[PDB]
């Protein structure tokens, strides 16, 4: 059940699993986040409404001067997108707010209002989001990478080991809020427990308990369990709770009933506790020595005196037992301490507690928060209440409360805003229990502690900071507040908020240039998480902790796609099915499980909600109904993974792909690659430059179509219909009768984007693929972009590789590319460089853009027209002129004998200095397009007038073609008027269309309908008169250029770089390479049938770097081209549709269980010929990533062709014509072309420009300056005895500004001497030391 | 050499040293002990027969392992 | 990660003392951590030797040995398998191709069923355990003292056997015989070499060649005392007694021989032995 578009070539699809969650729209992060940002949102939640409800209303100094909020608006831009890339504006959208300045009357708190002046005030231009989540800030398409930062809540950290040298670990616990004072708990190595408010001094941690209305009795009964001792007529009985005695010294005879069930000295093993439980002991009679070290909880005083016998939390010695014996107590309370489990911590910290009771504790808090402030009753009350208990001065965000209740094993995920007695006490219990053995510590990386921002929330915060810095000014201008003379816009300033928001979108560690050199690059750049930036941890502070992968990445961030090198792991790329949760933490799909069934309901899980479940594994064969095939299946429960019984799973992975990203899920046979290698593979697939004829992955992974379509490059049909008029520019879809709106149907039209620059200087082209008179279904591609083909992402080209050494040309990783790959121009990649030539305004005068140039005859000026700009199309080369420009330079200041010379030949020395924009030395191109911006203070020249006329012709053509469709829709609606009630069918197609307004009709509601539709027609008329007026006026106006520039002339060269020894190349699995000798055809190897193997890689790179996936891909490719050549023979020897059907059907079934059966008996006889003609280059093959095609499937798919099952053909060398012993592997591997081109990298500099502060080399153009002869190189030269080369390496070649010119004079005059002198850098050092008062001089002898 | 080759060497180093630590722990050589090195209880047959020459009863082992779980 | 040749005269002593009287009366050592103390007649220690496991002895507590009686013996590679209980023997689970193999010594004349390891056996005796089970005269296993747990001796692979079935056994009888530093080698070990950082516990080394004794007793640091041939004697130095001495009260040591142990810091060697010595250390 396929469409008519999908049948262009139906990708053979292995992969055994059924997909149950189709791939989400890959750009959900950017789009949905910026959608939450900018929208009138009738609820106080996120969006701009959040910021405005936060900072407004502004009340003055209580003076009945208020400025409140009403509602805002997003006026449409003045320049739309492509206009805004041409000209250079920020694709903004002017903001508007309805602020409402109210002024209450004095002698009135809320008495009668005296003025409510309601006026709408401008502020800022928020740069809107394109349809592809890519803003346009200054002409270039920029992208704001999602950030990943610590969620405000609670954290229990270790800081294990190194401190204190005893090895003993500390267990600190931090309560970070959204906004307010922190709170920390920590152990000392002496094991007492201490607190600290915001990172200030430590404190005896019981002081905060006491400050919260806790005296020692209830402290000890919160942080401890009770053991009562009894004095029942003889010597110190004890309560026996049976499980109190696991792992403890038996320092006494544990008898019972006068029977000995446990004996002294031993240890109470589980046997003993078992037997005491079975033998029912409850009150054991132990000696006094065992109470001698116990601790007494409650307070005891002589009941006859009221004098304090034992304070709370004192150790009972024998004397105190005696003393309270004579007071009439048979109950005694003792803390159940223990070295293992119920440790003494709060008790011994009370030992450390200097203070005694509540008021003293509040005093100490007041003296630790701020010194010098004398303590006080109410000062202490206010300070302590306002640390953690002030709704104004402290608020966990609701995210804060949610983490704080999920990390305590609480109940409600949402609740209060400030802390409480119970929140603090639960923190402390959790802390002590962490240290007691039960419980564990949340390591940093755990994605339950990495809330994900994105464009929306970050821009919201920047607008927030803007609002605070402006409400300062608002309250200030309200200080002087005249009641009714300042409207609600002189209080504000617009440029503040615009400054903040532009600073974010244009200067950030996030808002960065789109890696727009390959559709996979954009859609793997917009899906991106970053841990750097403002508010995240940067490298120095942190640090190795967050580089790591952590088992909560399984389906939430890709593990095998992260930028290797300087910052690994800080650029985690988001998974395939991942999402941002409601609160923010990354979440992912999982299929629900009933009693024992695998439901098809996908259910989302965040990070903190997972471990309490037990998730199955997607690689589980299930039994045609939703029951597993076994009773025990692999699963993963809490980090660990293991076998579980069938009746225990709760969640199955949505699909085998979800562990990866869109980066590494395109690598076919990813499953057989060492993870570093898939890392480098994805990170070299993000850089493939779009070739000239982008072919297709001959072996793909299923996700490639979704990446091509969901990225913006393909030209996706908005509505299904017939194709009326294709063309290299535009595609005209005639919408069908059912997908067609009721009024003014019309037809959809797509203006493609022909040749044009992207940021990385490549060609972002679009070519139609659906030809004239041809159906298209909704949601289908019309026009392939760069590196797409038929809507299947084709980054590089497939080609014939043969693994074999072949004379050292591929030594380390080098590659040997036969000239059949470069003759065809199949890696010939097109690069569209932009050269600008401004025309500035110096003190001497304005630069000219004349065609009149000195010291260059007609020679270099043959390509220039009458005005100094080159023609569109002249094939400039290295060193020619594109824009003739001359600057007036007075004071020629003639010299000696040069003056004699001018006398000798009378040649008038000109007043003008040539500065024309000449092509960079080396490129060789075609000037595809010249644009001339002009300050509107200059008379536009002749060529700019040509350009204005031409663009205006174009825009007139376009907008008139638009008006035609529109009026056709309105005539349609007119017929829809007549069709009901008195339509005259054939009396309306004969006569002219324009004379339908005067068509007869009875004066019912339908005559008034005709009148109304005539009104609509004339409105459209005047509308497009005035709209073409506005188009002509946008074109005709001057530009608004930088300060002091007359006119800029942009010239778009279009180089075509082919391929040449040095151009890096690479497969997908991470086999790099540097194509190293572009061999003839004859020389290459050739299999017994004749075909020369185009590339020749190296065998020594498959075992050493375990990326055997490239050998399996090579074999699947060889089988694929086997099928291809079989269809080619069946089609060239032209057979029929019948043989083709039987053979393609044999290819598409092919054995093992698959989810792809197509049944070509429904393809019409003429579709299968088209299907063949698209397969005649070779049958594509899918292979979902961790669910690929196992080897034996490949072997049978080879045997379906006629290749040898071994995969290894016997090759004959091309030069000697004699068989390679030991057959080689040959196949069709898909190889990219990385854009580390050679001619971008090559560089050489003999005498260029120079610096200005130190006479060193400095060039610009391609760092047109010498290589850095750094320090380690100087160590090298000193290691050799060579010292002359060093002396000239930093005296003659580099700095000594007489040494270098004398060296050049000597070199030209054929005397290789050198006259060093002394470096100008050291002379600067003498001056910089001497400006300080340090007289450094050089002795002279 | 490449940047993944060096990472392979480091991964070999890391897992080899970890595994060889944990094989250094387990004894596999008899020194028949017959009752604890701390508590004195008899070590049962099954435990002394799995791990030959193990000085400590089961409970003493769990207890020392738990005091060491907080890393000394 | 091959016997104690006593040299001097004096009484004998053991600390951490534990051993068993073998059938030959030799008070053969079962304990590991016992140490032998060669005492002079003063009542103070002369020399010390850390007891080998299952070593052979002749002398005992508080008795004079003279220089030359090699009392403390130990088989240099073999790990003795002595047994304290008194009884007879049977062999259970020692089967050809399964746990042991048929192994005949031709130089002794008796066969030794040297226990075969986890890689030398097949599925017929894979999980099986070579068990030397002690018995009484009845054929019942002699209980070991202090357990309701019989006496059957476990033998890992590679263990050469002393005697076969039918052999009576008693204490101090090795049934079996099994054969017999942290060199942090990163780069940061090399940086910390050239930086010459003083280690954690400096291997305490002498000052001068001369006789010794012990002085002021542990006001924190117990004090060593060093007096020359005849010269500048007054040096007596603090020493954390929290780590062992490898010296005795009456030794005339050469300067530059370890009193204690540990990675000796380089400053010590340079000031004590000579520059050649320290450069060879590094
Ligand atoms: C009247 C008709 C209404 C829809 C039926 C109008 C609306 C837009 C018109 C087409 C567009 O201009 C594009 C194209 C331009 C070519 O150059 C000339 C042919 C094309 C096919 C035009 C024919 C026709 O005139 C169209 C369909
Ligand atoms: C990783 C490193 C190669 C990188 C160059 C190789 C080369 C030498 C190897 C160690 C030494 O052999 C000593 C020791 C041997 C033990 O038996 C098992 C572990 C030890 C620590 C080994 C760890 C690791 O395997 C080393 C560092
Ligand atoms: Zn024990």
UniProtKB/Swiss-Prot annotation, chain A:
Query: MF terms per GO, please?
Result: DNA binding; DNA-directed RNA polymerase activity; ribonucleoside binding
Judged by the first EC level, this protein's enzyme class is transferase
Q: Which InterPro entries match?
A: DNA-dir_RNA_pol_bsu_ext_1_sf, DNA-dir_RNA_pol_bsu_external_1, DNA-dir_RNA_pol_su2, DNA-dir_RNAP_su2_dom, DNA-dir_RNAP_su2_hyb_sf, RNA_pol_bsu_bac, RNA_pol_bsu_CS, RNA_pol_bsu_protrusion
Briefly state the modifications made to the protein after translation: Acetylated on several lysine residues in the presence of glucose.
Q: Keyword Acetylation: yes or no?
A: yes
Q: What is the effect of changing residue 664 to E?
A: Resistant to antibiotics salinamide A and B
Q: Which residues carry this modification: N6-acetyllysine?
A: 1021, 1199
Question: GO CC terms for this protein?
Answer: cytoplasm; cytosol; cytosolic DNA-directed RNA polymerase complex; membrane; transcription elongation factor complex
Q: Name one GO biological process term.
A: regulation of DNA-templated transcription elongation
Record-linked Gene3D superfamilies: 2.40.50.100, 2.40.50.150, 3.90.1100.10, 6.10.140.1670, DNA-directed RNA polymerase, beta subunit, external 1 domain (2.30.150.10), DNA-directed RNA polymerase, subunit 2, domain 6 (2.40.270.10), RNA polymerase alpha subunit dimerisation domain (3.90.1800.10), RNA polymerase Rpb2, domain 2 (3.90.1110.10)
The effect of residue 812 to K is: Disrupts the enzyme's active center
Q: What is the effect of changing residue 568 to S?
A: Resistant to antibiotics salinamide A and B
Reactions catalysed, semicolon-separated, are: RNA(n) + a ribonucleoside 5'-triphosphate = RNA(n+1) + diphosphate
Family annotation (PROSITE patterns): RNA_POL_BETA (PS01166)
User: What is one Pfam family matched by this protein?
Assistant: RNA_pol_Rpb2_3
- Describe what happens upon changing residue 674 to A/G: Resistant to antibiotics salinamide A and B
The EC designation for this entry is 2.7.7.6
Uses in industry and biotechnology = Co-administration of salinamide and rifampicin or salinamide and myxopyronin suppresses the emergence of resistance to both antibiotics.
Q: Which UniProt keywords apply?
A: Acetylation, Antibiotic resistance, DNA-directed RNA polymerase, Nucleotidyltransferase, Transcription, Transferase
Q: Any idea what job this protein has?
A: DNA-dependent RNA polymerase (RNAP) catalyzes the transcription of DNA into RNA using the four ribonucleoside triphosphates as substrates. Resistance to the antibiotics salinamide A, salinamide B, rifampicin, streptolydigin, CBR703, myxopyronin, and lipiarmycin can result from mutations in this protein.
Swiss-Prot record, chain B:
Q: Which UniProt keywords apply?
A: Metal-binding, Plasmid, Zinc, Zinc-finger
Q: Which residues cross the membrane?
A: none
- One MF term from GO for this chain? zinc ion binding
Q: Where is the signal peptide?
A: none
dksA C4-type zinc-finger residues: 36-60
The record's annotation in Pfam families points to: zf-dskA_traR
From which domain of life does this come? Bacteria
Q: Extract the PANTHER family matched here.
A: DNAK SUPPRESSOR PROTEIN (PTHR38777:SF1), FELS-2 PROPHAGE PROTEIN (PTHR38777)
Q: What is the protein's name according to its record?
A: Protein TraR
Which gene is the coding source of this polypeptide chain? traR
From Swiss-Prot, chain C:
Q: Which GO terms describe its molecular function?
A: DNA binding; DNA-directed RNA polymerase activity; magnesium ion binding; zinc ion binding
Q: Which GO terms describe its biological process?
A: bacterial-type flagellum assembly; bacterial-type flagellum-dependent cell motility; cell motility; cellular response to cell envelope stress; DNA-templated transcription initiation; intracellular iron ion homeostasis; nitrate assimilation; regulation of DNA-templated transcription elongation
PTM per UniProt? Acetylated on several lysine residues in the presence of glucose.
Q: Which residues carry this modification: N6-acetyllysine?
A: 37
Q: Any idea which UniProt keywords this protein has?
A: Acetylation, Antibiotic resistance, DNA-directed RNA polymerase, Magnesium, Metal-binding, Nucleotidyltransferase, Transcription, Transferase, Zinc
Q: Which GO terms describe its cellular component?
A: cytoplasm; cytosol; cytosolic DNA-directed RNA polymerase complex; membrane; transcription elongation factor complex
Q: Which residues form the signal peptide?
A: none
> What biotechnological purpose does this protein serve?
Co-administration of salinamide and rifampicin or salinamide and myxopyronin suppresses the emergence of resistance to both antibiotics.
> Function, please?
DNA-dependent RNA polymerase (RNAP) catalyzes the transcription of DNA into RNA using the four ribonucleoside triphosphates as substrates. Resistance to the antibiotics salinamide A, salinamide B, rifampicin, streptolydigin, CBR703, myxopyronin, and lipiarmycin can result from mutations in this protein.
Similarity annotation: Belongs to the RNA polymerase beta' chain family.
What is its quaternary makeup?
A: The RNAP catalytic core consists of 2 alpha, 1 beta, 1 beta' and 1 omega subunit. When a sigma factor is associated with the core the holoenzyme is formed, which can initiate transcription. The rRNA transcription and antitermination complex (rrnTAC) consists of RNAP, NusA, NusB, NusE (rpsJ), NusG, SubB, ribosomal protein S4, DNA and precursor rRNA; S4 is more flexible than other subunits.
Q: What is this protein called?
A: DNA-directed RNA polymerase subunit beta'
Q: What part of the entire protein does this chain span?
A: 938 to 1233 of 1407
């Amino acid at each position: 059940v396929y469409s008519y578009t999908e049948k262009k070539r139906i990708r053979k699809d292995f992969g055994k699993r059924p997909q149950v969650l189709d791939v989400p729209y890959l750009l959900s992060i950017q789009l949905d986040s910026f959608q939450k940002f900018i929208e009138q949102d009738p609820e106080g939640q996120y969006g701009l409404e959040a910021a405005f409800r936060s900072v407004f209303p502004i009340q003055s100094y209580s003076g009945n001067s208020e400025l409140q909020y009403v509602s805002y608006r997003l006026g449409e831009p003045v320049f739309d997108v492509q206009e805004c890339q041409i000209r250079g504006v920020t694709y903004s959208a002017p903001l508007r707010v309805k602020l409402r300045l109210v002024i209450y009357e004095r002698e009135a708190p809320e008495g009668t209002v005296k003025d409510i002046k309601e006026q709408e005030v401008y502020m800022g231009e928020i740069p809107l989001m394109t349809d592809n989540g890519t803003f346009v800030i200054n002409g270039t398409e920029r992208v704001i990478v999602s950030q990943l930062h610590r969620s405000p809540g609670v954290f229990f950290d270790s800081d294990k080991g190194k401190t204190h040298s005893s090895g003993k670990v500390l267990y600190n616990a931090r309560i970070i809020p959204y906004r307010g004072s922190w709170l920390d708990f920590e152990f000392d190595p002496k094991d007492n427990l201490f607190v600290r408010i915001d990172r200030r001094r430590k404190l005896p941690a019981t002081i905060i308990l006491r400050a919260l209305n806790y005296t020692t009795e209830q402290i000890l009964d919160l942080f401890f369990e009770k053991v009562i001792f009894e004095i029942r007529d003889n010597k110190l009985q004890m309560e026996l709770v049976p499980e109190r005695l696991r792992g403890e010294t038996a320092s006494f005879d544990i008898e019972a009933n006068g029977k000995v069930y446990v004996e002294k000295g031993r240890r109470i093993t589980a046997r003993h506790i078992r037997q005491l439980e079975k033998d029912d002991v409850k009150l054991i009679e132990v000696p006094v020595e065992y109470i001698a070290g116990k601790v007494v909880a409650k307070d005891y005083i002589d009941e006859s005196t009221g004098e304090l016998i034992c304070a709370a939390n004192m150790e009972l010695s024998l004397d105190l037992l005696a003393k309270l014996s004579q007071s009439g107590h048979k109950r005694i309370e003792t803390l159940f301490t223990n070295d293992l489990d119920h440790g003494p911590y709060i008790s011994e910290t009370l030992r450390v507690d200097p203070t005694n009771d509540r008021l003293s504790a509040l005093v100490e808090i007041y003296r630790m928060m701020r010194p010098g402030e004398p303590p006080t009753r109410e000062a202490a009350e206010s300070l302590f209440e306002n640390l953690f208990f002030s709704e104004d001065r402290y608020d966990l965000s609701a995210v804060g409360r949610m983490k704080f209740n999920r990390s305590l094993l609480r109940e409600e995920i949402e609740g209060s805003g400030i802390l409480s007695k119970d929140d603090i006490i639960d923190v402390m219990k959790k802390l002590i229990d962490i240290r007691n053995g039960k419980g564990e510590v949340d390591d940093i990386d755990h994605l339950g502690n990495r809330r994900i921002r994105s464009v929306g929330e970050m821009a919201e915060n920047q607008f927030r900071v803007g609002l605070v810095r402006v409400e300062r000014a608002v309250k200030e201008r309200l200080s002087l507040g005249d009641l009714d003379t300042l409207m609600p816009q002189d209080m504000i300033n617009a440029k503040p908020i615009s400054a903040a928001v532009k600073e974010f979108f244009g200067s950030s560690q996030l808002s960065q240039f789109m890696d727009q050199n390959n559709p996979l690059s954009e859609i793997t750049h917009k899906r991106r998480i970053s841990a750097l930036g403002p508010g995240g941890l940067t490298r120095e502070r942190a640090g190795f902790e967050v580089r790591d992968v952590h088992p909560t990445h399984y389906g939430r961030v890709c593990p095998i796609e992260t930028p290797e090198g300087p910052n690994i792991g800080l650029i985690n790329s988001l998974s395939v099915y991942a999402q941002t949760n409601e609160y923010g933490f990354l979440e992912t799909p999982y299929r629900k499980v009933t009693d024992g069934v695998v439901t098809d309901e996908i259910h989302y899980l965040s990070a903190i909600e997972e471990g309490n479940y037990v998730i199955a594994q997607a690689n589980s064969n299930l039994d045609e109904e939703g029951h597993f095939v076994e009773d025990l299946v692999t699963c993963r429960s809490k980090g660990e993974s293991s076998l579980f019984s069938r009746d225990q799973v709760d969640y199955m992975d949505v699909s085998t792909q979800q562990v990866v990203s869109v980066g590494a899920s395109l690598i076919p046979f990813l499953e057989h690659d060492d993870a570093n290698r898939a890392l480098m593979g994805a990170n070299m697939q993000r850089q493939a430059v779009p070739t000239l004829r982008a072919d297709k992955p001959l072996v793909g992974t299923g996700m490639e179509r979704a990446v091509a379509v969901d990225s913006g490059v393909t030209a996706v049909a908005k509505r299904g219909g017939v194709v009326q008029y294709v063309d290299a520019s535009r595609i005209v879809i005639k919408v069908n009768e059912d997908e067609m709106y009721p009024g003014e149907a019309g037809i959809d039209i797509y203006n493609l984007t022909k040749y044009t620059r992207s940021n990385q200087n490549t060609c972002i082209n679009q070519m139609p693929c659906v030809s004239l008179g041809e159906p298209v279904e909704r949601g289908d591609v019309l026009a392939d972009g760069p590196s797409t083909d038929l809507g299947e992402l084709a980054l590089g080209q497939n080609m014939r590789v043969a693994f074999m050494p072949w004379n050292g040309y591929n030594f380390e990783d080098s590659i040997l590319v036969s000239e059949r790959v470069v003759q065809e121009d199949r890696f010939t990649t097109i690069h569209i460089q932009e050269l600008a030539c401004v025309s500035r305004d110096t003190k001497l005068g304005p630069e000219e853009i004349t065609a009149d140039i000195p010291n260059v005859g007609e020679a270099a000026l043959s390509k220039l027209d009458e005005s100094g700009i080159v023609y569109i199309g002249a094939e400039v080369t290295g060193g020619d002129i594109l824009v003739g420009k001359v600057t007036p330079k007075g004071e020629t200041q003639l010299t000696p004998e040069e003056k004699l010379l001018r006398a000798i030949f009378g040649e008038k020395a000109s007043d003008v200095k040539d500065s024309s924009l000449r092509v960079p030395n080396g490129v060789s191109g075609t000037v595809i397009d010249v644009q001339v911006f002009t300050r509107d203070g200059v008379e536009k020249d002749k060529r700019a007038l040509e350009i204005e006329e031409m663009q205006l012709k174009q825009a007139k053509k376009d907008l008139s073609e638009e008006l035609q469709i529109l009026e056709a829709g309105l005539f349609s609606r007119i017929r829809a008027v007549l069709v009901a009630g008195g339509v005259e069918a054939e009396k309306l197609d004969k006569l002219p269309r324009d004379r339908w307004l005067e068509l007869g009709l009875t004066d019912e509601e339908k005559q008034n309908q005709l009148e109304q539709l005539a009104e609509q027609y004339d409105e459209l008329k005047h509308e497009f008169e005035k709209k073409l007026e506005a188009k002509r006026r946008k074109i005709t106006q001057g530009d608004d250029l930088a300060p002091g520039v007359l006119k800029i002339v942009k010239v778009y060269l279009a180089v075509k770089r082919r391929i040449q020894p040095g151009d890096k190349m690479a497969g997908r699995h991470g086999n790099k390479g540097v194509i190293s000798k572009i061999n003839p055809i004859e020389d290459m190897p050739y299999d017994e049938n004749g075909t020369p193997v185009d590339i020749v890689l190296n065998p020594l790179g498959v075992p050493s770097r375990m990326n055997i996936g490239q050998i399996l891909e090579t074999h699947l490719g060889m089988a694929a081209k086997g099928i291809g050549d079989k269809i080619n023979a069946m089609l060239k020897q032209q057979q029929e549709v019948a043989k083709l059907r039987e053979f393609i059907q044999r290819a598409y079934d092919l054995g093992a269980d698959v989810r792809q059966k197509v049944d070509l008996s429904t393809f019409s006889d003429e579709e299968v010929m088209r299907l063949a003609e698209n397969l005649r280059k070779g049958m594509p093959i899918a292979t979902p990533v961790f669910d690929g095609a196992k080897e034996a499937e490949i072997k049978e798919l080879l045997k379906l062709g006629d290749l040898p099952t071994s995969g290894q053909i016997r090759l004959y060398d091309g030069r000697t014509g004699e068989q390679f012993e030991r057959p080689v592997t040959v196949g069709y591997m898909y190889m990219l072309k990385l854009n580390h081109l050679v001619d971008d990298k090559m560089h050489a500099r003999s005498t260029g420009s120079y610096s200005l502060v130190t006479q060193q080399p400095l060039g610009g153009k391609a760092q047109f300056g010498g290589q850095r002869f750094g320090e380690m190189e100087v160590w090298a030269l000193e290691a050799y005895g060579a010292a002359y080369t060093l002396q000239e390496m930093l005296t003659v070649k580099s700095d000594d500004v007489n040494g270098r010119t004398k060296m050049y004079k000597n070199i030209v005059d054929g005397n290789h001497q050198m006259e060093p002198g002394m470096p100008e850098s050291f002379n600067v050092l003498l001056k910089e030391i001497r400006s300080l008062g340090i007289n450094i001089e050089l002795e002279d002898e | 050499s490449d940047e993944a080759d060096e990472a392979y060497s480091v991964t070999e180093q890391l897992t080899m040293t970890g595994i060889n630590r944990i094989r250094q722990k387990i004894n596999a050589h008899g020194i028949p002990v017959y009752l604890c090195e701390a508590c004195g209880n008899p070590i049962p047959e099954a435990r002394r027969k799995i791990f030959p020459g193990v000085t400590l009863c089961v409970e003493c082992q769990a207890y020392q392992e738990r005091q060491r779980k907080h890393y000394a | 990660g091959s016997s104690i040749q006593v040299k001097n005269k004096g009484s004998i002593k053991l600390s951490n003392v534990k051993s068993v009287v073998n059938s030959s009366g030799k008070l053969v050592i079962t304990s590991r951590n016992t140490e032998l103390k060669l005492i002079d007649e003063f009542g103070r220690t002369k020399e010390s030797y850390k007891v080998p496991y299952g070593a052979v002895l002749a002398k005992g507590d508080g008795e004079q040995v003279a220089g030359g009686e090699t009392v403390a013996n130990w088989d240099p590679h073999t790990m003795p398998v002595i047994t304290e209980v008194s009884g007879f023997v049977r062999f259970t689970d020692m089967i050809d191709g399964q746990t042991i193999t048929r192994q005949t010594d031709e130089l002794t004349g008796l066969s030794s069923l040297v226990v075969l390891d986890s890689a030398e056996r097949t599925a017929g005796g894979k999980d099986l355990r070579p068990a030397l089970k002690i018995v009484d005269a009845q054929g019942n296993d002699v209980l070991i003292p202090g357990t309701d747990m019989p006496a059957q001796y476990f033998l890992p692979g590679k263990a050469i056997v002393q005697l076969e079935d039918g052999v009576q056994i008693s204490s101090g009888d090795t049934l079996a015989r099994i054969p017999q530093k942290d060199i942090t080698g990163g780069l940061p070990r090399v940086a910390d070499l050239f930086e010459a950082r003083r280690p954690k516990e400096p291997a305490i080394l002498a000052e001068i060649s001369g006789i010794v004794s012990f002085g002021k007793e542990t006001k924190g640091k117990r004090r060593l005392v060093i007096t020359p041939v005849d010269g500048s004697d007054p040096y007596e130095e603090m020493i954390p007694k929290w780590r062992q001495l490898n010296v005795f009260e009456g030794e005339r040591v050469e300067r530059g021989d370890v009193i204690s142990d540990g990675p000796e810091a380089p400053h010590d060697i340079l000031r004590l032995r000579g520059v050649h010595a320290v450069t060879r250390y590094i």
